[PDB]
Amino acid sequence: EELTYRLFMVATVGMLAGTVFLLASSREVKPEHRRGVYISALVCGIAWYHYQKMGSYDTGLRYVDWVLTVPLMFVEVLAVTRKGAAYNEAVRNWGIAATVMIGAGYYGETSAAGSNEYWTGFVIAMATYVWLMRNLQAEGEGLKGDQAVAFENIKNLILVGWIIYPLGYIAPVVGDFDAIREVLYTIADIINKVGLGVLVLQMARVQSGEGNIFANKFKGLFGKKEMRILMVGLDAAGKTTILYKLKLGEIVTTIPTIGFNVETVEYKNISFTVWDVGGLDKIRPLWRHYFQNTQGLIFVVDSNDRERVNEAREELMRMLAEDELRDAVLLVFANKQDLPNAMNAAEITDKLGLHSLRHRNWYIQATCATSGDGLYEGLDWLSNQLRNQ
Ligand SMILES: Nc1nc2c(ncn2[C@@H]2O[C@H](COP(=O)(O)OP(=O)(O)O)[C@@H](O)[C@H]2O)c(=O)[nH]1
Ligand SMILES: *C/C=C(C)/C=C/C=C(C)/C=C/C1=C(C)CCCC1(C)C
């Protein structure tokens, strides 16, 4: 009896420790994948509040915790492998299945052990349990690389760790084991809830990493609407390197006239057009054929090139004078931050005179095109300005 109360005290402290850790590390994940770890911290917080409360024992106290957390634990798993309509369909179906599973378990546990109502709730709960575990096994078939390995660990934890619950359910009918049921339930809750949140965190950590061999890092940013983006800058600013790093498609290089090189990348309804500004004066008039309906203007500048930083400003200001780009949102990539002589973002802002720009929605991001750092942050801002406005 005293061991059952000691585990309730350990569970309360354990759930709270996993709550703050899951919250403290949530800032490292990109905002696209932070929803999973937020739910993960919410599961431990709900378990902490209910284990603080834990005639006789209160079965309803634990089943109230299960009926809320189990669907949420499926939400943070489905938020990893699905998105959009497929995510909402699975959350509804799995949440309903978990609700019937937990509800049937409460119907049977609140009856006489070994009675027909006890086994009926066991039969219904096991059927939905097998259904949930079969759908979980079939999840993540499209994942590859580190995400597939990370999701395999999430699957294995639930597929193995949740077996303790039906075993603990049948303990009262295989022996004088009323106390070991709460022991099995409590230890399983600590292992599964704290464990899944850690595994959900490591998953979202992978989805936010710089490795992009499978080309998934920058696709969940721009959405489905039309978005014409012009990315210009001086030669050797890093524009082609950024195009490759986006992993949004093969670069299409054209030469419409001798001395004018154009690079395009198309994905969904999103397009990047790239050329070098400056150069010969006879080339500048040809840029006007590409300005119409441009929604985003990305200006790349070599932060390590201090001799040409003043010409970079002159080209940007000439571009911002074009009437066809009066509504274009400006995003400035302070590229090559990894180089030792690289000017910081505030210095590039001062050298380019961005604070003098009126009626212009702009933003500057320090970036390293070789490693990709900063590219997601700048594009997430640009995508947010163009989608929400
Ligand atoms: N160290 C460093 N080098 C970069 C970075 N971005 C581009 N480069 C280098 O700059 C050189 C030319 O860049 P490029 O993409 O061709 O610039 P573009 O002419 O505007 O397309 C390449 O050799 C890149 O390796 C960066 O962020 N850091
Ligand atoms: C955070 C709490 C967790 C993950 C609880 C999970 C509960 C289940 C997997 C247990 C379901 C049951 C059966 C499969 C059979 C007997 C009745 C239940 C409810 C114990």
Numbering used by the authors: 2 to 55, 62 to 396
What did the authors write?
In summary, the sequence alignment and the photocycle measurements confirm that MAR is a member of the PR family, which functions as an outward proton pump at neutral and high pH. Overall, MAR consists of seven transmembrane helices, A to G, connected through short intracellular and extracellular loops. A retinal chromophore is covalently bound to Lys200 of helix G. The fold of the MAR is similar to that of other PRs.
The problem can be addressed by adding a spacer, a water-soluble protein fused to the membrane protein to increase the distance to the nearest neighbor and allow for large-amplitude motions. With this in mind, we designed and used a MAR-Arf1L8K,Q71L chimera. Arf1L8K,Q71L is a mutant of a small guanosine triphosphatase Arf1. The conformation of the MAR molecule is similar to that in the ground state of MAR alone (helical Cα RMSD is 0.4 Å). Arf1L8K,Q71L is located at least 7 Å from the predicted hydrophobic-hydrophilic boundary of a crystalline layer and forms only minor contacts with the AB and EF loops of MAR and the cytoplasmic part of helix G. This suggests that the MAR-Arf1L8K,Q71L chimera could be used to study late photocycle intermediates of MAR that are inhibited by crystal contacts in the orange-form crystals.
